[PDB]
Design a protein that fits this description.
The structure is cut from a larger assembly and holds two copies of chain A.
Chain A (H helix, E strand, L loop, with lengths): L51
PDB class: protein fibril
Keywords: bacteria flagella, helical polymers, cryo-EM, protein fibril
Entry title: Cryo-EM structure of B. subtilis flagellar filaments H84R
Chain lengths: 51, 51
């Protein structure tokens, strides 16, 4: 779902744009990951697990 | 001679008349061209507003 800004008057005089950020925007392999790299943005481990 | 003379002036009148017919059609097509210009503008603007 790439974003096409028209830039010039004629055909193809345009570009592409993309973007992604949300809760699950931690370290991204192809998906974020499973038990890691998703919660770290979404659910911190700072419950007790550092103790 | 006279036949071809008066016939010739009449033919010239006929020609001018043809010109003015062309003037009408040309004005219609002028305006059509303005429309199509506006259309193209809306197409370009539509192009970026695909995003």
């Amino acid at each position: 779902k790439n974003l096409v800004f028209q830039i010039g008057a004629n055909a193809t005089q345009q570009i592409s744009v993309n973007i992604e950020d949300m809760g699950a925007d931690a370290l991204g392999i192809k998906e974020a990951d499973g038990s890691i790299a998703a919660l770290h943005s979404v659910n911190d481990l700072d419950v007790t697990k550092f103790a | 001679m006279r036949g071809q003379i008066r016939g010739l002036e009449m033919a010239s009148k006929n020609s001018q008349d043809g010109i003015s017919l062309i003037q009408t059609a040309e004005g219609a097509l002028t305006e059509t061209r303005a429309i199509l210009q506006r259309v193209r503008e809306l197409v370009v603007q539509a192009g970026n507003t695909g995003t």
